Each structure stands twice: as C-alpha cells, then as structure tokens.
Write a protein that binds this ligand. Sequence first.
Ligand SMILES: O=S(=O)(c1cccc2cnccc12)N1CCCN(Cc2ccccc2B(O)O)CC1
Lengths: 343, 18
Amino acid sequence: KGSEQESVKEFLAKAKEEFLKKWESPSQNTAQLDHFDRIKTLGTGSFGRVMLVKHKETGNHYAMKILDKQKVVKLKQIEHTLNEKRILQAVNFPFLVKLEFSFKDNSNLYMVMEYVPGGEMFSHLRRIGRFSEPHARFYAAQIVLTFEYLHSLDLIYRDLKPENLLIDQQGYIQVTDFGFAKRVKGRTWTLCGTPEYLAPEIILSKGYNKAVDWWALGVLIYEMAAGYPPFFADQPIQIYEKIVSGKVRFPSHFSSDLKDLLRNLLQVDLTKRFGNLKNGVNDIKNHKWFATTDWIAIYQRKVEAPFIPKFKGPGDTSNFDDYEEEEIRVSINEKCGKEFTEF
Amino acid sequence: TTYADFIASGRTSRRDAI
Ligand SMILES: O=S(=O)(c1cccc2cnccc12)N1CCCN(Cc2ccccc2B(O)O)CC1
C-alpha cells in the first residue's frame, strides 16, 4: 500500500505540472455556435441556460452551457464564470465533467461538455429516497479522490451537493460546477455555497480553508445515506443555527463506522476535522467505513457501479425537466468585451 | 419521522447557492 501512495504522490506532481501548463495558457475559442445543432433546453439559471446539442460533423451530443454576458456582469459573477472555464479547461480527472469546446460571441459565453444523459444525482436520490451504505460509499470514494486531486492543485471546491454531480453511463460520478472553485493557498473569505452544505466557519464569517470541502463531504454522505441532509429547516437562518450547534442526529440504520466517519467530517472545529489533520486525506481513506474500498480500482473505473440509470439512447432527455424553448440572442454589438477578454 | 419533517420543510427541491 505504501508503494501505492508513492504512486499517488508522483501522479499528483505530474498532474500539477500539466494543470499549470494549461492554467497559465488557457485554451480559447475552440469552436463556434454554427458547429452545433440545438436539440432541447435542459436547465435554466439566473444568467444562462444549458442546452442539449449535437455536433454536426461528429454527431456526438454535448451539454452546452450558455451564459448571458450582460447578466453575468449585472449579478457580479464575472470572476466566478472566468474561473469556471479556466479551471475546467485545465483540469483532467476521471470524475470531472469534460470541457471539450469553449467560445464567446457578442452576447454570450459558451462551454460545451460531453453529454451525460443519466443526469444529476439529485433527482435519482430524491426519487429513490436514499442510497444504501455501499451505494453511498462508492460515490463518496470518488469525491474523496477528486478533492485529493483538486486540493493538490490548491483548488478549493466549495460547491459540493447532489445538484452538482452527474451519474454517467457506467454509473460513475462527474462533478459539474467550478464557478465557486478558487486557487487559494491559505484561507479565503467569500461567503458562497449552499445553506445545507456550509461549514460552520463559513457561516461564522471567519476565514476558511480546504477543510470546508471535507465538511461538505460529510453532509453529502449523510444526505445520500439518510435521504435528507443533516441540517435542514424552513429558512436558511435556522439551518445555520443547527450547523454551528455541534449536534447531529443520525438515523438508527447508520452503521457505527459511518457515524464515526461523519462525526469526524462534520466536526465543527476545523482544526479537528478529518481531511485537515496531520495525515490529511489518509485519515479518510484509512477510516474503517472505507475498509472495503479499492481506491486504485475506483480511480480506474474498474469497480462495478451499484446503479446505472436506464440507458434510453445517447440523446435521451428524460432525466431533465422540460423548459420553455427560447432563442439564443446575439447582438450586432459586442457586449462586456473587456470583462471577458480572457475567456 | 425526520424524513417526514424534511418532506415538509419546503427545501426538498434543487437548492440554489446563497
Ligand atoms: O445541466 S447539468 O446537469 C450539466 C453540467 C455539466 C455537464 C453536463 C453534461 N451532461 C448533462 C448535463 C450537464 N448542470 C449544469 C447546469 C448547472 N446547473 C443549473 C444551472 C443552469 C443554468 C445556468 C447555471 C446553472 B448553475 O448551476 O448555477 C445544474 C447542473
């Protein structure tokens, strides 16, 4: 196993070198709108939409995230949007969505990612109710490796939740969103994230570091295994009080190993939280709840998945909602050119 | 049950950042 972890260290050193190369010289304008056939709208957001499209020459299906530059600026999301694209075009890991193309025009920013028809973990989790612990652990293991990877690049993730995780056709996870991801060596202070997933030190407006991602992993494992998150209420303010309280109630069916893992991840004191101790991520990888987990095998996608969303065709949209279909507006005049020069 | 309380909280749908 000790040879396995010298291997892990050499891998991360190689990945940091490769990431910094693409990080320091990002790809730009690697396709254009006319290259795709629009099929259907898969989601809407305050400053854009996601569309299922098909590459004309290739025939491959893609999720195309289209952001209105004017609204990005209005809602003060410039830094987040430039970061999402710069990060995605530079990272390379099995459980991250794959950015294939990006480009911009007078009005919009476009990011084009391989289409995952299974959709979001969120809807499967809510329909099924909860996942069994082996099922939950298979997903968790992939987030653990993914955070090891991102953290080795000094990237804090800050956006973990079932909404931002896809289940692909082999039943493995793809992490979707990087708008809140930031390269940070020590602490940062932006109040961002989702109420249910916020670590106590975020809520308390003290600086915080990568330990907030290990907190969020605890929330995610809990929500997956229980069917509801550990801290919920009618209003966000009531959630925050529960989070900082230091108390969590576990369902009666949670194993003793799972409870002990979660107490160490949902540790309100970040200096005592697993993932942030001397041994770092190994305290998690070496915890008894993960004794049966073949980390090498997970990375290699060799473990058989406990759930494969029904294969209904590579352009199926059944796992996404229906939205009113609207034109993609492109002005005859360039908008916000300076804000998005690096895109 | 706690799940019933959850399916009563109004926070069972996709959760926005904030
Ligand atoms: O539509 S997604 O599931 C998605 C994202 C990335 C790759 C994908 C590959 N195949 C299929 C879907 C894919 N996904 C992408 C959209 C981001 N939101 C909602 C959303 C919708 C519109 C604009 C922004 C946002 B937002 O978050 O802040 C939810 C997750």
